[PDB]
Swiss-Prot record, chains A, B:
Any one Gene Ontology cellular component term annotated for this protein: cytosol
Protein name as catalogued: Orotidine 5'-phosphate decarboxylase
The keyword ATP-binding is annotated on this UniProt entry: no
Biological role: Catalyzes the decarboxylation of orotidine 5'-monophosphate (OMP) to uridine 5'-monophosphate (UMP).
EC class (word): lyase
NCBIfam families: PRK13813.1 (NF010386), pyrF (TIGR01740)
Alphabetical list of PANTHER family matching this protein: OROTIDINE 5'-PHOSPHATE DECARBOXYLASE
Organism listed in the record: Methanothermobacter thermautotrophicus (strain ATCC 29096 / DSM 1053 / JCM 10044 / NBRC 100330 / Delta H) (Methanobacterium thermoautotrophicum)
Keyword presence, Ribonucleoprotein: no
The protein's annotated pathway: Pyrimidine metabolism; UMP biosynthesis via de novo pathway; UMP from orotate: step 2/2
Similarity comment: family membership: Belongs to the OMP decarboxylase family. Type 1 subfamily.
Amino acid sequence: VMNRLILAMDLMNRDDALRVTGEVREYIDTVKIGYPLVLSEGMDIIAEFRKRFGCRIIADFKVANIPETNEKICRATFKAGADAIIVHGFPGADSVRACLNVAEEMGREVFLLTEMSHPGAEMFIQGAADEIARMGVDLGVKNYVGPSTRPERLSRLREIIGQDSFLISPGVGAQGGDPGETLRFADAIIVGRSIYLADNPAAAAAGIIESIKDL
Amino acid sequence: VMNRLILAMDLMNRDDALRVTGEVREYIDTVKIGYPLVLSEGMDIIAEFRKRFGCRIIADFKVANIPETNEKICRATFKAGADAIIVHGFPGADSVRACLNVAEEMGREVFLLTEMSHPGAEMFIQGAADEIARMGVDLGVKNYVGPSTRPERLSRLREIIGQDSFLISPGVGAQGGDPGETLRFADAIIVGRSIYLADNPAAAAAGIIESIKDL
Ligand SMILES: Nc1cc(=O)[nH]c(=O)n1[C@@H]1O[C@H](COP(=O)(O)O)[C@@H](O)[C@H]1O
Ligand SMILES: Nc1cc(=O)[nH]c(=O)n1[C@@H]1O[C@H](COP(=O)(O)O)[C@@H](O)[C@H]1O
């Protein structure tokens, strides 16, 4: 990932999403697109971003249904041009395997979400997160998501998945996480509001990158 | 819900989804639409179904992100015309409250998913499900989803949420659940493939209803 920085593009308007992404494209070549933008503007937005910006697209679709439904969601998402899809591990191994099978068929990637960054993640997810990570390892998952807001958890996750696995981390900036600290454990950070709600998104991205280079 | 039967419309083609829903509309006035259809045909499909069939629409969007993102997803979903949205409880109380707040603002409903119907639900969700249900009760949730495939779990869920709460249940037919047994505890059953992959969906729906009337 260019500059170890992934833009979370959660603006809900195509014009604003295209403006901001264009402004920060010199700094960022991977964009995470989720349901706020896709449900507002359509799945065609993924191929539009890929063509216009030449970026990789990670679909943050928190996939979390039964295996048969997960299959259909993954196939629609890869058909739309996404490079990778973020999948919850909490629904269990069969739900994750369904996504892995479609990614294998379509030459794409799954990122396994093992612990979330928000306060409510402490209630149920955190207690299962180590086991979710170990399940990922046993399924052959190579790409993971864990929380910038809890670097001790992010260290434990890294310990389980090993150094070869790729780990990306949201919760930097708005949610309280720090770029440098998070990059002690994660390969890349995800940043949304700190960039896309800034008066100058390019300056916000550049400031983050400057602090990343220093590491 | 008419005949206590909710159609899970997970066909991915607008023409096929419209045909099947039209064929079974005399039996069913509530349709659950999820991401397989929405990601393939667009969010406009929700208002199209509402207008053409005059049905209620439950969006099975398994909402499972951080509170801020859940807010945006719920607002886009209700803007598109959905009557209700299914929300995972596993991400914790703040993630659920975010959905409840948007539903309150927009005069809509949240259904809390507490335990899932597939085999993988045993790994992590089942152990948290009673607590997820109790969290729902303490947040004032009145609508719940629980699994036809485990009627003893569905009985325990009903026990926690009480008799006034509304409980709907997937996993009937294809996944192995039984209509009559499930309706001992749930107010309505959700049925997808047993109807929409049948040679005669209307006959399949009618057969299910005939077994429901007998109760
Ligand atoms: N996928 C996620 C998993 C997670 O644990 N936390 C999280 O924030 N996200 C997403 O990352 C982004 C964080 O954006 P921000 O807090 O930097 O605005 C948003 O798109 C969230 O939905
Ligand atoms: N929302 C769900 C929660 C759940 O626990 N199980 C489940 O099957 N569903 C959904 O219900 C429907 C079951 O359809 P079928 O098994 O009758 O085809 C599908 O849309 C699933 O995604």
